[PDB]
């Protein structure tokens, strides 16, 4: 069950549930399988707190084994596009969606804990139907995968011919690894 | 115990019957008879196929086993062909291909379903391209049409009944009796 | 059903969960097989309770059967990272993410009650793929297992060869066993 | 549905559920089958009710026909842990895990109803595996059994010989049974 | 399916035709075995075996493997629709001479896979067990088609699927045939 | 299923071939215990038995176990596949001088493992029985392999695997074929 | 869905579930099957009512198809153990454990609407195991029965050997026979 | 969704669901197939409104299938037992067990609409057993028979032979032929 | 199933051995029920039975029981595997020195358990009936081991297991064997 | 399984001995009765008929009891095992001096049972048939035991046991054999 919490303002006492009361601090939970559903709460999230305060930063833990590729982009495209700066801090687990919203982050704001593990590979995918309609789909696979390798380059800085080569098969990078792969910025270790 | 019963005079009559979905299980059936037969005689062997469609990699291996033993196989289409059958039905030569009146043909192009990495997805689509261009060069050397022609009709379900299969070249002569049969 | 309790405080009457009025004394509960969902709320409320107080002493009682090990991850980095000392009091039994929790608390505020168990295993996984796949997962659970046993060393006090040792199969302990061991520091028996 | 009792206190009236109101009174219902989730709720409400008034004692009813082993310690742990004296009602049936709580209660505050039931029987698992895994496991659970046969010794002052041979097989307990073989005190009858 | 084709392996045994159609079993295993040795008995003449399967267990292939080579008779392979990993291992039990496959054949050689769930330490040797498998089937394959080991582990990475004409290059078949007269007996 | 089995059955017993495939069950010792005393009354001639099973029901291997040293004639072990813990105890029931095996074949010597449910005093009486049991498989094996029970126990701690190859050193298989002409009768 | 009703006290407007509200008029609602959860609420109902007013007078309405023993007995017994009369009104069905409760109500004080049906049976049970097992089993359950029995011959003054002879098999009777019986007082017609 | 109302009363404004508002203006609703908790509702719903005041009449909208004989009987003798009238509109259909309630309400106010079908037959039922048993049961079913064909008899007044004769099979009736029968009085058609 | 089974039961009358392999159940009864009668219409020799079952019905256990005493020839009985309470009771059938065991037999005693659901007057004549099996079972294997009905019923409380060794000193079992040669007909 | 009891049956007819194991459904019907008037077409021997069956459809066990008095040799009945409602009515169809038991046999006399669901008069006919078939079957066992069938009618209320002894006693059981011999042919 989801505890209470009082923040107990100046001008009256108010009851917040233990995540809402973190959101007002601008700080927004990923957690469990990526869908449209729990996306769009992240989303929603990052919009209001752009209107609380469009200039303080915000804070976006990650801690996913992946999921659907269209509502990790939803993600993606709005943290760019807003004007705060959406930090990442991994607590434990990014597979496929959680490292590319752990990379998407602003530079120098990419964290993660001392014993998180970061994985990366292509887009798994599933379709069936006529030879005309798997080549079209094919495309539409091989296209995705072109665009999320030509990101991961941007926020990290290696050339394309290695991401392609790291995520044809499942590659784990610890806290160190990541740090000189590019994929973060800082191992946070102690207050 | 009926199948086995009746086998035993299904082998002096040389009549295989083709009915219901090609599978693993049908191949190995009608492989067999066909090889038996052959052994038997070099007399014409008659098969019968109807079936709604199934595993093109079972239709294959029929196909060839018509072309790889000796005898002349007499290839009568009846009710429906779909394209495992229609596959089967083309192996047989011209001359030897016949059909009945309220037949149906059925030309498609083959699906799948594929799960995985992209890059195990790309190794798939090339092997249903190539597995396509081969099913289209087949048809064309019996229906004598261009593989282009039999491309642009199959892009979707292309249902031939049994007169404009003969004009399309699939079908040689419409019987209703077996005294209609010319053998070579 | 969740029983209400009222604090009746100075400034008047609030009704309060029973979880929710632990809380407010730096109490946390672990309960169940341990996962994503109820780790992340675990990770909420030591956040929240650092900034309510940075130099009082949070407990946290566990009595669960063990779960995912990349769930346990992010509840010890956060115990490690936060200042705040996390006092562990282990109530029913403690299996081997239990058991690590445990021996993750601050040095001379583990504690255990006369009838409980703590067993520590090696981490349990599976997976299912091609030969190269397999080598690749292979090398990750042989990385986790090792980490862990450092850990267990590190607060235990124990070589790592007893450790490993030790973790090849199922072994209790009671909390007069456990106290010798190092995984924890007394025995709570009477008030 | 539960329904809901008001209290009409000095301050006004209030809104409690009937297992909220009879809490303040210092009451507490161990119901269905025990496991981990509702052993929790009884430690937090026997906790709550020491801080409120450790002098006063605590009555806790038990109709549950049994369950985990591990869940119920915690409880009878608990029980002799804090200092008020936790009463013990048996309202129905009290089998293995049940009794053991019904025995654990403060000496001469011990009762049950003229047609309530008593039962005590060996611990009862289960377990697959290797021969080592279950050589292990037979250890376990025979230690366990000697450790809840000491318990109904000190609190009925029979010799463990007996307590070991009433355990082995399934034998039910009448309340006036009960009174000679030490489980209980009183046979509450009419007010 | 049992009365059926007792009928068909009664004419069947006495031309020496062995067909092996669907996913590679224990079950098929057993009864494609029987087959082979009965047959070693009644004479040494060739043997006809026809290979049509999707996959199936890797142990069960070995198997039939080792019959081929175990019985005294050639054994004549003619690869007909599609084969697989368990496949591809009894098509190269026969000798490069006794190859044969038809027009419409696929091949496909894929590393083998499986699951595994325990401890890490289970998990450990299971690994070991796996890498041995590859290495072996590997060295089956590079002996039948004459190319190194090294290069066979770098194409089977991925499921590599290959047609009848692309097989004679790569060295699996020796002559692709479409009647029973192209055969050359030994 | 009985019609193509029976079959090759009537050509099986003139041959004196067991095929023991599959998981070691109830209803396989049934047939494969008929198999070997029919064979025994038609005359003491050699069997050839080929093992390829994952394992199963170890009860069911004592039966075929004592069942091969009951007959008279002699029965020569051919291991094919994988020789599991089951199949392994079948493997060891033939003497050593008669147990041959292929190349490509895997030995996996593991202790009984099994579930018990209820009270513990029932639990106990589980678990002398299964301390029995595996006490009463290492000495078979030390008789077959020469090793002592000691040097079993500590391997068998876990899953412990063996090529046909590794088999030989370890004095489980006396020499391993590939034909045969390869083998030599007593 | 639960109607809500408003008191519409002096104090001010209050809103009470359709069940609250005829609870403060000291009315208890037994419904369906009989069980462990929903027999512990009945209790917590008659024994806060009890400290209301331990003179006024309580009303249980029983409309149920029977059930557990266990959980029926527990409210036989809180219903004779508290001071206050329990009245007792048949609307729908009474089976035995149903007909256990409304003949244990005080005398003079026992109803049941003019279609209403009682019904009383031989308790039901279900075991397997040993013979050891059922031997043991087969008592307890014959020890039951003589009690339930011993209870209507109480209340309703008919010879006990009655009561096991009518109790064999399935009888069946309406409101005047009932009163014939002693199993109840008035039959309730219009008001 | 159930969607909420404003009575917009002196003292203020209250908050009501759309089928507590309609029960403050003596309106009751039986939708859905009969049973033992949906009709308690009912009931309750019948008590509260005459104590409010047992002189305004009451109207209960019928609209089911029917359901159990039990937890009907309970309804129409509650109606029959509080002095104030019970209108009974039958909207929708009304079945064996909805017609029994139709007809129950108080002579000169039971309606029906224009397309409303009513239908009465036989009380269905089923039970397994010995031969004992079975005679048993034949008998109960047989004078529940009775005691619904005595029930119409009174209230439609068709004498006794004609009601088992119509009640042997299913009978549909229009508004227009209840009228006749007797089983309404005025069908509504307008205001 | 039967088909080749069928084909084995020419040879296996000529040889008169019976194997009771798997659970005790109502078909397995009439099919071992009418093997043993029609051997014995066929000639008075010695029949072998093999026993190796977990468990079973009581009363299927029952018919062969009786049907062993019921016939002329003498039962020779030979134990393998696991010999449960059901296959206990029909292993008691045969005579003491008819009575023979594997080296790696195992054996199991315990009272029957069984089920009820319904009226506490229906429960008492089950248990009843539940008592007088306990106590009829007892007295069946008191008679055959030499030993009181009283110790039978102390030992068999929980689950009795013993070896093959430990029956001897019982005296359920008379002689351990490992060969054919072995036994001696009376 | 068919094939088995096929191949049995060549002998099963020449000792003329029917078995009757398992619950009585409409598919034992046509087996038993089929046996019967074939060996009837046969010759006039004797027939012995063993019953174990845990009960079943009781207009099944009409068309056994039916046969046996309809066909002209006499059937000779071995009570084996358990004797239910359903098997015990078919046991009752054999003449008194032809009804034997074994030592351990059992025997259950119960009141028919069923269920019914639907409307009142429905119920109300189906009342009326179980009546008159509890009667009917009463009138049965009066005849072949020689009770009044007042005496059946209260003991059959419950579950009533019987075992051999009693059985005796009661006049459902002439005589308790162990051995084929001790039978006296009319």
């Known amino acids: 069950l989801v505890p209470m919490v009082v923040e107990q303002s100046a001008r009256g006492e108010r009851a917040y549930d233990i995540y809402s009361r973190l959101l ?14 729990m996306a769009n709460l992240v989303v929603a999230q990052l919009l209001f707190l752009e209107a609380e305060n469009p200039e303080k930063d915000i804070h976006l833990y990650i801690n996913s084994p992946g999921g659907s590729v269209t509502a990790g982009m939803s993600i993606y495209d709005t943290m760019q596009f807003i004007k705060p700066n ?3 801090t991994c607590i434990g687990q990014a597979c496929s969606m959680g490292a590319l919203l752990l990379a998407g982050g602003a530079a120098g704001k990419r964290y993660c804990l001392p014993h998180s593990r970061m994985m990366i590979h292509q887009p798994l995918g599933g379709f069936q139907g006529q030879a005309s309609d798997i080549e079209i789909h094919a495309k539409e696979i091989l296209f995705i995968k072109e665009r999320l390798n030509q990101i991961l380059a941007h926020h990290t800085g290696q050339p394309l011919d290695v991401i392609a080569r790291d995520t044809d098969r499942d590659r784990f990078m610890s806290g160190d690894e990541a740090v000189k792969y590019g ?8 207050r | 115990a009926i199948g086995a019963k009746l086998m035993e005079y299904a082998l002096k009559v040389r009549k295989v019957f083709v009915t219901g979905g090609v599978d693993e299980k049908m191949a190995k059936d009608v ?7 052959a052994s038997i005689s070099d007399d ?3 098969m019968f196929v109807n079936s709604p469609g199934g595993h093109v990699e079972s239709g294959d ?5 018509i072309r790889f033993i000796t005898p002349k196989v007499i290839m009568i289409g009846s009710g429906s062909v779909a394209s495992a059958g229609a596959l089967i039905y083309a192996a047989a030569d011209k001359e030897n291909r016949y059909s009945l009146p309220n037949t149906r043909f059925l030309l498609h192009q083959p699906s799948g379903g594929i799960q995985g990495p992209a890059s195990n997805i790309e190794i798939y689509r090339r092997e249903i391209v190539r597995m396509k261009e081969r099913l ?3 048809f064309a050397e019996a229906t004598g049409q261009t593989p282009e022609k039999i491309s642009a009709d199959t892009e979707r379900d292309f249902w031939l009944n049994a007169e404009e299969a003969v004009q399309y070249g699939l079908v040689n002569k419409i019987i209703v009796s077996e005294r209609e049969i010319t053998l070579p």
């Open chain 1, 24 to 37: 007002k601090e601008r700080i927004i939970f990923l957690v469990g399988q990526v869908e449209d559903y």
């Open chain 1, 86 to 88: 959406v930090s990442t």
């Open chain 1, 183 to 190: 994929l973060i910025d800082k191992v946070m270790t102690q």
């Open chain 2, 31 to 37: 492989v067999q008879q066909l090889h038996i037969l």
């Open chain 2, 44 to 46: 014409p062997i008659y």
């Open chain 2, 61 to 65: 291996m029929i196909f060839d086993a």
């Open chain 2, 136 to 138: 289209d060069r087949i």
